[PDB]
Amino acid sequence: AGVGTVPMTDYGNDIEYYGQVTIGTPGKKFNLDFDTGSSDLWIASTLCTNCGSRQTKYDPNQSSTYQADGRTWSISYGDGSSASGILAKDNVNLGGLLIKGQTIELAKREAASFASGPNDGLLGLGFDTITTVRGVKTPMDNLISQGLISRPIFGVYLGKAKNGGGGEYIFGGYDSTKFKGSLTTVPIDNSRGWWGITVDRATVGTSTVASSFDGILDTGTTLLILPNNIAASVARAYGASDNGDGTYTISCDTSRFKPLVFSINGASFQVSPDSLVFEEFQGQCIAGFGYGNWDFAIIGDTFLKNNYVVFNQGVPEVQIAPVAE
Known part of the structure; x- marks a missing residue:
């Protein structure tokens, strides 16, 4: 390589x-x-x-x-x-x-x-x-x-x-073979030591499930962890049920689901329907999004595996674009 x-x-x-x-x-x-x-x-x-x-x-x-x-x-x-x-x-x-x-x-x-x-x-x-x-x-x-x-x-x-x-x-x-279109520059808030960004809004179809919220780009976290209210709002959009442990049970059939779209600094980035399902165990599927008792979101692998990211520690800032596939 x-x-x-x-x-x-x-x-x-x-x-x-x-x-x-x-x-x-x-x-x-x-x-x-x-x-x-x-x-x-x-x-x-x-x-x-x-x-x-x-x-x-x-x-x-x-x-x-x-x-x-x-x-x-x-x-x-x-x-x-x-x-x-x-x-x-x-x-x-x-x-x-x-x-x-x-x-x-x-x-x-x-x-x-x-x-x-x-x-x-x-x-x-x-x-x-x-x-x-x-x-x-x-x-x-x-x-x-x-x-x-x-x-x-x-x-x-x-x-x-x-x-x-x-x-x-x-x-x-x-590597530009890994993404499509132009990269979008997004400012980073590193005041807490993490790669923090602001998401302008989140939508599922025509429904705005969330307004602006802060989150951190974390490759070390598997799911997309959202604050209580935001997670509940997203869950209702997909008919997922709370498991009571920070995770949701969602339909294994994602063919009917619309992508979860994040608007960041004027551009749209999404979590594809297939990514809405993290794991299937004995006929039951666990959602790719969960909730934590935090005021900010932990934007983990569920999101990152759908979007290429260039981390710039110098500015600091990140450049994002939808993954090629």
């Missing part, structure tokens, strides 16, 4: 997407979840006492460029999962771009959800204002300062399991 290009693997029915990253010297390949919702780069290590036997573990002794660090780290994600350990320093190769002396976080303990997951850790693509340890420069920070990318951007394509899955991140550029 081209320079800075990292092919992604689609896990399950668009649950999450991970890519290979080489760490250390000579180095081992790790499968990391690329998460724009966090800013820590942590991986399972041989110091971990409750990690999965299926995960590839970083071994300090096997890297000639390992450098000890006396600091510890601890992180707790929204979905309740967590991990903790010690910091370290080593080289990280991202799609051919060798970041030297990147601060990496070695897990000594991780939640069962991680031990049973398909990845060996996470690569945080959020802003450095939310790194769990103050003073830690993120991979994007270092790609920029070390001159590995000429433009402070990364293009993101997330495929659909129904179309063969896959996906691809391009650091320092983007």
